[PDB]
Recover the amino acids of this structure.
């Protein structure tokens, strides 16, 4: 179930994005509703450090690929 | 023929002034509403007597006199005033503007008879400006900070209120509001505005940008 | 001839916006109610000045300008706009929509004189959409 | 009674002026004696901060409205 | 007539990408090998769906769209594109490049029918450049 | 005939820019001094090459181009520009302003030959404005308070410096300086300004009044 | 000696002014130098409460009588 | 023809004002030295802009205006002012003294063209007296 | 050597730009290869705060002067 | 011819002011008594010097100057002042009222020579009003 996917405390972001995109594209949603759902799940899941990282984006991110690129650039190396 | 204003509207306006105050935008809108048709000096005088307290009424009489004197100076500086006439016999004295001239003292019917429509609109605009002055006088922007727990829209509302209701010229409010958004508005929003890939040149644009990219918490 | 909106209705609408907020369906219904007859730029501008706070009013001015610009782009994309005319001399500039054109600045009577009914309804729809945007943005 | 009106330690000046003008105009004085009485009551009542503010007026104030305007301009914001 | 790529070659390429990674010169050589004949949007899309993981596939869709948009800008900047024609009725829209146009959605046979060879080679070069970008970005 | 600027003056100006910086009033005065006679594009270009570092020189080239483009827009908006002529054959292109036109590239003598005096003064004013922009860019007023032990002239100097060297429009500096004198400038001077029997409508008048009636300590 | 006159900690201001004007007028100064000396002695003597009271005078006091009147008006009743 | 003052002398005078202050007799002597030839309003204005800080410069502008107003009152009190002429068409307005008149704003060459030597010496004496006042006031 | 120039942790950006432009223009590169090299060195050197500041530029910067102006405008005052 | 006031009456008045004060009705009656005949500026000045202390004397000089200035304003507002004359050559300056004019400084005989009776009564009334002001102010 896509709506139950959370980014674990120790999980990296690319694994979380892979799992989420997999569960969203392999589901019962229409094809035209996958990108907005993936974006809004990146924003509300993806534990509050990345949540604030996406929130304070000086540019407007309108695609899952752009969000992934931005987060991978500005992520807290740890 | 003179028709008085409804005491119901006047009572509602008086209670509006009593609860909201003199300076609220709703109060100024209501005054503009009851200032729609050109009023005779009797009407405006009684209106301000009823809606204003004693001390604001004294202040308003002073300010109205000063504004009418400026109007009469402009009138003697231009013989084409809609209150004036072409010959010298139609020059309008302050006794005719304040309703003190002959055949007008205490009588609204005679007032409405002898007065010109240009006279009426000039008196009305003068009274409105005097009301604005007294309202600004009866009740500091550079001391406004965004509190640690305060949201940004409340801070923006408070700051824009204090800047527009102050002694600055009209052409100096937007730059001051912008530069106060940048230097107040605690360092998280300060850095959010600083790192703006676009150049924000308006308080509305800054507010929109900050509301978009703000840290949801 | 221009007739102003009742300050009683405006006061009631302002208190509605004050208690219920900008986004409640009752508030949007009340705005639609007071947005029934085509309003002149003066009317809508003063209405938003009274019912909205300072910061929402700035946001609303921005959004209204953007929506009016989209309308003017559609107007230059179609010479059959109810605001436009057939010849090029009736093309509607943003100074005429925002009430900034000659013979209109600060004067609602002259405004009502020179404006078209299509102009009025376009301005009104633009203002309503801008109000919706700002309400969705404020909260 | 107008001659018993004092500006309270915590009262603002516009409230004091309203109360005083009310009590003076709604009294048994002749109409031609209200303005001088209101002025001289502004000067002797209206606790010593405003008393000194009115005393050190570089201009001569000859009307209750002018005194009110001057005091509202130069009052100690607090 | 459309002929699919061998699932054996695709499986070998997928395991190559799995062990060597996206950026190794051997992997890019293998991709160039399987990118030899001009592929239809269906072929490249399924190929990237199989060889790439979910997140690299999203990145690749983004990059492919951007590169195709640059191609279409160059095409509207030159009416002599091998994908374009001489008249205005042969101008190539992004729905025709991404395989979204009418008569192409989900059908590779119709795709191969309506597409031009210049269209195919442009799509292929765009996909290769997008793969290079995503490979440089992922690691 | 073209005469070069003295390398002694240029060396002194370069050392002035090196020690005082780009924004000091003495530096701007020195630049105005060496910007007295109308200079050819060659002169101003070499001058900025010598006195400015590499990055400020790049910024200055950008700003000079932008200002010259604004000048050329005003020139195509008015055929009576002192750089233009009456016919269309005297219209001035940016290649002629930047010294890139034919017969001018690298040759100051030919430059001085073909250029107009209006062209020279326009180029010079453009270069001065560009220098001002870059100086303001290379290196907060609403955070300035008068310290408990600081004198008033130091506070006024600091405040006027920070307000005039900021992003405010020129017509908004005096009201901001006044309203910052009134709200900053710790409550003794605040009350001293508040209880002013006269109305002070200029920073100089406020400074004079406060210096007269200040508490000697 | 006029230049040795100080206002005592407990002395009133009218006594100090009387003593100072007496010692200045009954001295060897020219007649045209008594008023400036009396003023500048009011400003520098007359212990720091009255010193600050004279310093913060919104009007310019240019006569010993005017200074005396101002100080008597705004003095700290004690 | 207008010749500017040396920036070397101005820099030395500025450092003198910076170390010795505004009121030292050496500073007043140096100012009298640089106040020897009759200066145009442009020269004195820029000189005070450079040597004085912001707040002393504001004070000096005020004092200079007041002294020039006293000069203009004396000028309207005597038609034989070396700045005035015999007829009424040569009466000198404060816009001509402060350099604000037509053909003078920002242009020192035109300034030097239209100004009289009596005008120059009156402006110079006024500026010197204003400097003395501000120096006595600052410390 | 231009390719060894890094912006120090405590160094300002104008000093780094001066040093880099000096070393690039005083080197063996052709004249037509200096601007692209200076730009690409601004992007890859100039420690990751300014790197991300240049990366997230809503406009396309195609000149060292424009990059310098943008960075000087939006730099983190510290 | 000038005749001085008796030092016996002046001593009695000084002791009255010393015991009863400045504001007692008996003191004001005594002052009115010694203010019966029109006095020359010399007489009133010496009288106030003797009966008043130093600080009340300074206050009285101030108040007397202010009242005389009001009198001179009324005099320039009416050419029919008993101190004035019909032509402009008889206009009365404050130097003539305060006894500072030419031929009067320190000499009471010349004072009595050049002064008018209207001048004397105006000076006397001014001095009486100033005494009243100072008496109301001192206590």
């Amino acid at each position: 179930p896509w709506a139950d996917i959370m980014q674990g405390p120790s999980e990296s972001f690319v694994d979380f994005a892979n799992r989420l995109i997999k569960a969203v594209e392999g589901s019962d949603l229409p094809p035209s509703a996958r990108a907005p759902v993936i974006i809004d799940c990146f924003r509300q899941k993806s534990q509050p450090d990345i949540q604030q990282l996406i929130r304070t984006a000086p540019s407007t991110l309108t695609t899952p690929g752009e969000i992934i690129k931005y987060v991978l650039d500005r992520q807290k190396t740890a």
In short: Chain A has four helices and no strands. The radius of gyration of chain A is 12 Å. Residues 12 and 46 of chain A are 10 Å apart (CA to CA).
